Structure formats: structure tokens, C-alpha cells
């Protein structure tokens with residue numbers, strides 16, 4: 472029906488700072504039945520100074536900061552045309568270039584005044600990770616309830632132990648009308664927090680995680696990579712497949728919570744800035760979706776930007792988990808991980824290959840394979856290309872000389888993992 476295919480937007484209006492900090496808010500935002508939530512009056516209720524994220528303030532703060540520009544043809548939010556302008560298509564291609572905040576600002580400001588073109592420029596992926604450079608901005612985001620913050624005990628990304636750019640650091644987007652964010656799910660299905668600084672609106676579209684394989688099938692049919700390509704759903708295709716589509720406007724000061732694995736796309740209707748980062752709540756729902764996308768990525772040779780094995784061990788070492796469903800999932804992941812390390816050690820020892828203990832140091836990143844981008848946990852196959860390259864076991868073995876010239880390192884002895892694992896118990 473027309474009613475079921477156009478579901479109402481899950482919405483919250485905070486009348487007070489107290490309601491912002493209610494446990495009811497966290498349960499509403501993370502409810503699997505709410506794929507996306509818009510929190511009206513969030514900035515006002517928390518007295519957030521969003522002026523700190525105004526274009527004028529940003530220019531003064533770091534005018535020469537790099538902006539990744541996406542050049543796009545301006546089109547209505549429910550349209551994406553082929554080159555002839557006669558039919559709708561899924562692929563939504565852009566050109567990628569670079570400029571500065573100061574220069575993008577002048578373009579943003581000048582277009583805004585002139586309104587008082589066919590081709591537009593979208594200022595993307597602006598990196599607000601530098602804690603000194605963006606101190607007042609980042610400090611302002613400490614006013615949010617804990618579950619929404621960049622860093623918190625209940626956020627899996629706060630147990631990584633190092634920076635994951637754009638996930639546990641804030642990204643800024645500077646927009647003019649028509650600036651288009653193509654359809655996607657977040658890295659490893661992690662939740663996202665997005666605030667419109669404004670002065671104008673953003674239009675949002677979203678589909679429940681449940682339907683993602685159908686959207687992936689459309690992408691394949693229309694010649695674009697679902698996981699890594701740039702695409703814009705044809706709404707009529709979605710409706711013809713009985714897929715409900717959420718549609719709403721995000722006004723200045725409104726916070727959008729993108730729940731785990733929600734497929735979403737966005738278009739600026741006015742001139743505005745957006746800020747965003749990811750959160751991974753420590754729930755069975757989020758953890759399951761994170762691990763299944765982790766496994767699917769490996770099938771499809773796509774890098775998992777969240778190193779889920781590394782993360783699961785860190786969580787197990789420090790966090791008390793009381794939910795039996797989530798505990799079981801983490802416990803299983805850890806046991807599989809120990810077994811996988813063990814198989815590698817045994818085959819290395821059978822081959823007569825030496826393993827050196829390397830250990831871990833503070834702030835050390837998690838490693839990925841240079842050839843296939845898979846997470847490489849604990850047992851590292853290392854080659855000298857000063858410059859060292861890490862490989863997974865398969866790719867190391869595949870080298871023309873096999874393991875000749877490859878040094879194998881171990882970052883955690885069996886006993887280290889066994890002791891961490893044994894201490895990880897279900898909390899009362």
C-alpha cells in the first residue's frame with residue numbers, strides 16, 4: 472500500500488536538557504524498528520554552539536584545510552538522469568578534486584548571495600581529527616548524551632585504541648543546493664550521528680537494513696558496485712519491489728541518528744554544513760551486523776575499516792558485558808580467533824619457520840594485508856620493501872619465493888589470548 476511504502480519518520484522533540492539525557496532516547500534511537508531517527512531541537516535543548524561549525528568560523532580556524540570536492544550535475548532529489556536526459560539511472564558519477572575551506576567558503580557564500588548552476592561542487596570529507604586545531608568545536612560535542620559522543624565507554628570505536636579516520640573522528644561536509652550524498656551503508660554497519668549546522672535544509676532518504684541485498688541486486692543489474700560504487704536509487708524501482716522508503720527533512724540543529732546498517736542517501740536542499748561520525752553501541756544487534764559485514768567484505772575483497780577482531784579483544788579485556796546474546800557472540804569470535812592463530816603457528820612450526828615475538832606498543836594500529844586488505848591479527852607476515860609491509864598468510868605463501876625473506880611476527884602469545892579470554896565472563 473501507499474501507506475506502508477511511505478512510513479512516517481521516527482522523530483523525537485527534546486523540550487529540555489533532561490529529556491536529552493533520558494534512557495528512553497537511547498532505546499528509541501537503537502530500536503531495530505527505527506532504522507533512522509531525527510531529533511528535532513537537539514542543538515537548542517543542549518545549548519550547542521553550532522556557530523563554531525559555521526563556514527565563517529571554520530575559515531578563521533583553518534582556512535587552508537583540505538576539502539575533497541565532488542563535482543556534480545544539480546538535479547532534483549527524486550531524479551538521476553542518463554546523459555540523454557530521457558530516463559532515470561542508478562549510477563551517480565562525480566569528479567574528484569581538491570581545494571581549501573577558504574576557497575570552498577567563497578564559492579558557498581557567493582552562490583548564496585547570487586541566488587538573492589547546472590554544475591555544482593560539494594565540499595566533502597573535511598577532517599576535524601586534529602584536537603588542537605579544532606579544540607572548541609570538538610569540546611562542544613561533549614555536551615551530547617554519552618551514547619552519541621565521539622568517545623564513550625559504550626562505543627566500540629572507543630575500544631579500537633587508535634584513530635579510525637571519519638569513524639571515531641569527526642568529518643565535516645560543506646554544501647550548496649543539490650550537493651548529493653550517494654546511497655550506502657556505513658563501514659561495518661556502524662551507526663552514524665549527523666548534525667545539520669545549516670543555514671539550510673537537507674533531505675534524507677532511508678531503507679531498513681533488512682532490504683540491503685535487494686538494493687545490492689539493483690546495483691548489480693544497473694552496472695555499479697554496491698559496496699564501493701556511487702549510486703542513487705530510482706524510487707519507483709524500490710516501490711515496485713515493495714521496499715518502504717523513509718523520507719524527511721533535516722533542519723538546522725537537527726540530529727539524525729542512522730541506526731545499524733540503514734541504507735541512506737542525502738541531498739542538500741539549501742546551503743548548509745553537516746558534521747558526522749560513527750558510533751558502535753555495545754549491543755548484540757550492532758555487533759552481529761558489524762561481524763556479518765566484516766565477513767561479507769572479506770568475500771568481496773573490500774577493506775573493513777573497523778578491525779573487528781582487534782576490537783573484539785580490546786572490548787573483552789576491559790568491558791563488562793551483561794547481555795547473554797552479545798556475550799555469546801564476542802566469546803565465539805574470540806575462540807575462533809585463538810583457533811585461527813593456533814593453526815597458523817602449527818603450520819609454521821611444521822615448515823621449520825621461526826616466529827619472533829614482537830609484542831604491542833601504545834597507540835599501535837591494527838594491521839591489514841598489503842595485497843587483499845584483510846585484517847591481519849596477531850600473526851604478521853612481514854617483508855622489507857625502513858619500510859615494512861604486512862601480509863596475511865595466504866598472500867605471503869603466494870609470493871614467488873613463498874616465505875623466503877618473510878619474517879613472521881607474533882604480537883600476542885597463546886597465553887596472553889587465553890588469559891584475556893578466560894577473564895572475559897558474563898557480568899551480573
Ligand SMILES: O=C(O)CCNc1cc(N2CCc3ccccc3CC2)nc(-c2ccccn2)n1
Pocket residue numbers: 541565593595596644651652653655656657658665701737745746747
Ligand atoms: O551528506 C551528509 O551529511 C553525510 C555524508 N556521508 C558520507 C559522505 C561520503 N562521501 C562524500 C559524498 C560523496 C559524493 C559523491 C561521490 C562519493 C561520495 C562518497 C564520500 N562518504 C560517506 C561514507 C563513506 C564510506 C563509509 C561510510 N560513509 N558518508
Ligand SMILES: [Co+2]
Pocket residue numbers: 655656657
Ligand atoms: Co556515510
Ligand SMILES: [Zn+2]
Pocket residue numbers: 840841842843844845862863864865866867
Ligand atoms: Zn592478503
